[PDB]
Each structure stands twice: as C-alpha cells, then as structure tokens.
C-alpha cells in the first residue's frame, strides 16, 4: 500500500524508528546547551547508585553550579520541566518506585539509556561541560 | 637621614622589576604604601610619618620560571593572599606557542630591527608630549556615577561574590 500511497523497503523504514538517539540524535534531544549540562548532571548523581530522585539530582546540580559558575542555578520547577524534555524523546524514563515509610509512597527514580562511551564523544566537542566532566 | 626610591618619586609610577626576588623587609614596606599612602617609621633615628601617593607597577615570574598547568595558581604564585588581594589587576601574560600568531611577532621584531619605523598601518604613533598633555588635562576631571549604573554595579558585584564564593 506504500506503492499505492505513493500512487524490505519498509523494514528499512521501521528500524531507523528504533535505533535513534545514542549515536547521532542525542544532540537533537539537547539543542539547549543547558540540557547538555543537565544530562551530565544526572550521570554524576548516578555515582551514588540510589533511588535517583529529582531532588538528589537537584542537590548535585546546585552544589556543582556554585563551584563552576557556568550558569545561574535555576528553579526546581524549571528542573521539573527540563527533565521532561529529556523524557519525551525516549532517553530517560521516570517511574514512581518504592519507599515504605508511612504508606506505599512514591518517589521518582530515573534510569538512563546512555553509556559513558557514547557520552565522552559528545562532550569533548564542548569545553563548557569540561569543568563539570 | 638618607632616602629610598619611594620618596623622590612622590606623585607617579613606582615600578618593581623581579618582584619575587625581593625579601620580607621590602614587601612589608611595599604593602604599606600599597594599602594607604602614608608611611610611618619609628627607629632609633626618628619616629615620623611621610606621605607618598604612588602607583605600584610590578613585574614578576613564577617559582619555576614559567607556568605549570598541573599546579594551582595559589601554589604557582609565591605571593600571599593579602598581597594579591590588594592587587586589583594581575596580568597572567603567558606565552603559548602557535603556528599563525607567532609569525606576526616575528614579522614585527624583524621590521623594527630592519629600521626604526613602525608598520604601515593607517595610524600614526603619537609623540610623548601630546598624550602627556592629555593625561594632565584629563586628571582635573571629577566624574560622578549615576543610579542606572549603580543598579548594574551592585548586581554584578553580588553575582561575582556568589560565583567567587574553590
């Protein structure tokens, strides 16, 4: 019907839907240079391999941005919207995981589909994240 | 009572070549006229004060001659925090070898060693008397800051203090 719509061609059409953002279209997701900064900020918080909250990420985001003054520290509410820009492209997923203090209480743990090998290529082209590593 | 180099040069430029080659006795007297223009000396000869409005120009080199990128600048510079904290402008005139920019310095030194004339740019170098007269005419001016520049000054100072405040 594609040759009716235009009045293994399609398997070629369907696999590029799935393979990309890690090799090429990562920078498509982060046209904002701060979105590049906030993406490395998540991985620096992943050293403490814990329930990666949006606050503990915001903790490491402030305490690094006071050391290197690349930008002003932004809001948590801004930090809410910017990580959702990272979300809709399909890079990082957010789930409401478990903490069992009072009830089944839902803090948000993130997870990234990128590796440091596919990170280090796209950051050496920008020496402004080079203070942050 | 004989005198040094800070007393015959009262109102002007006092320069120091090889700043790190001096001692503590020179530094304690240089920092005293660097903070405020009055020197006071109380020795077996006299206990007196004297003023000397001077502008300190200093030329220094690091600990190992040249710089070190693996070393911090607080460790590269042997001067203490109170000395360069009083210094508002410090110029890190560092040389970096390049391919394109070194040729202009080489062309300029061969042009001034070929003859005394300067390069053929569309500008003429002014003689010492005219800008000496301009400096003497500009020195009587007393500028007053506005409020629109005041709100930019305090915001830049707050941001610089927070950025500087490792």
Swiss-Prot record, chain A:
Maturation and modification: Ubiquitinated by the E3 ubiquitin ligase complex SCF(CDC4), DIA2, and TOM1; and targeted to the 26S proteasome for degradation.
Cellular location(s): Nucleus; Chromosome
Domain of life, per lineage: Eukaryota
Signals that turn on the gene: Transcribed at the end of mitosis, but in cells with a prolonged G1 phase there is a second burst of transcription in late G1.
UniProt function note: Plays a crucial role in forming the pre-replicative complexes. Interacts with the origin recognition complex (ORC) and MCM2-7 helicase complex leading to the linking of those complexes and loading of the replicative helicase MCM2-7 onto the pre-replicative complexes. Required for the initiation of DNA replication and then actively participates in the suppression of nuclear division.
Subunit structure, interactors included: Associates with the ORC complex and the MCM2-7 helicase complex. Interacts with CDC4, CDC28, DIA2, ORC1, and TOM1.
Membership in a protein family: Belongs to the CDC6/cdc18 family.
Protein name as it appears in the record: Cell division control protein 6
Section covered of the full-length record: 343 to 512 of 513
From Swiss-Prot, chain B:
Subcellular location: Cytoplasm; Nucleus
Entry superkingdom: Eukaryota
Motif range (Arginine finger): 85-88
UniProt binding sites for ATP 1: 61
Residues annotated for ATP 2 binding in this entry: 86
Note: Present with 166 molecules/cell in log phase SD medium. Early fractionation of eukaryotic MCM proteins yielded a variety of dimeric, trimeric and tetrameric complexes with unclear biological significance. Specifically a MCM467 subcomplex is shown to have in vitro helicase activity which is inhibited by the MCM2 subunit. The MCM2-7 hexamer is the proposed physiological active complex.
Function, as annotated: Acts as a component of the MCM2-7 complex (MCM complex) which is the putative replicative helicase essential for 'once per cell cycle' DNA replication initiation and elongation in eukaryotic cells. Core component of CDC45-MCM-GINS (CMG) helicase, the molecular machine that unwinds template DNA during replication, and around which the replisome is built.
Similarity comment: family membership: Belongs to the MCM family.
Subunit note: Component of the MCM2-7 complex. The complex forms a toroidal hexameric ring with the proposed subunit order MCM2-MCM6-MCM4-MCM7-MCM3-MCM5; loaded onto DNA, forms a head-head double hexamer. Interacts with CSM1 and MCM10.
Name used for this protein in its record: DNA replication licensing factor MCM7
Species name: Saccharomyces cerevisiae (strain ATCC 204508 / S288c)
Gene behind the chain: MCM7
């Amino acid at each position: 019907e594609i040759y009716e719509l235009e009045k293994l061609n399609y398997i070629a059409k369907v696999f590029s839907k799935f393979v990309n953002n890690n090799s090429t279209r990562t920078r498509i997701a982060k046209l904002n240079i701060q979105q590049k900064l906030i993406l490395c900020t998540i991985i620096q918080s992943l050293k403490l391999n814990s329930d990666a909250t949006i606050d503990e990420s915001f903790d490491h985001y402030i305490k690094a941005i006071t050391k290197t003054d690349t930008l002003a520290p932004l809001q948590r509410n801004e930090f809410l919207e910017i990580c959702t820009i990272l979300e809709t492209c399909g890079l990082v997923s957010i789930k409401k995981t478990k903490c069992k203090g009072k009830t089944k209480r839902f803090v948000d743990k993130i997870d990234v589909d990128l590796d440091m090998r596919e990170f280090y290529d796209e950051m050496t082209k920008i020496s402004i994240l080079k203070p942050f590593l | 009572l004989e005198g040094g180099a800070l007393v015959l040069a009262d109102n002007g430029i006092c320069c120091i070549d090889e700043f790190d080659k001096m001692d503590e006795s020179d530094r304690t007297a240089i920092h005293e006229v660097m903070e405020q223009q009055t020197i006071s000396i109380s020795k077996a000869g006299i206990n007196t004060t004297l003023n000397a409005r001077t502008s300190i120009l200093a030329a220094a080199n690091p600990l190992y001659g040249r710089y070190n990128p693996r070393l911090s600048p607080l460790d590269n510079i042997n001067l203490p925090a109170a000395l360069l904290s009083r210094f508002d402008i410090l110029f890190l005139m560092l040389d970096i070898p390049s391919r394109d920019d070194d040729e202009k310095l080489a062309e300029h030194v061969t042009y001034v060693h070929m003859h005394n004339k300067q390069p053929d740019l569309d500008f003429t170098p002014v003689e010492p008397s005219k800008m000496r007269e301009y400096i003497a005419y500009a020195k009587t001016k007393r500028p007053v800051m506005s409020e629109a520049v005041n709100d930019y000054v305090v915001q830049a100072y707050i941001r610089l203090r927070q950025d500087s405040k490792d």
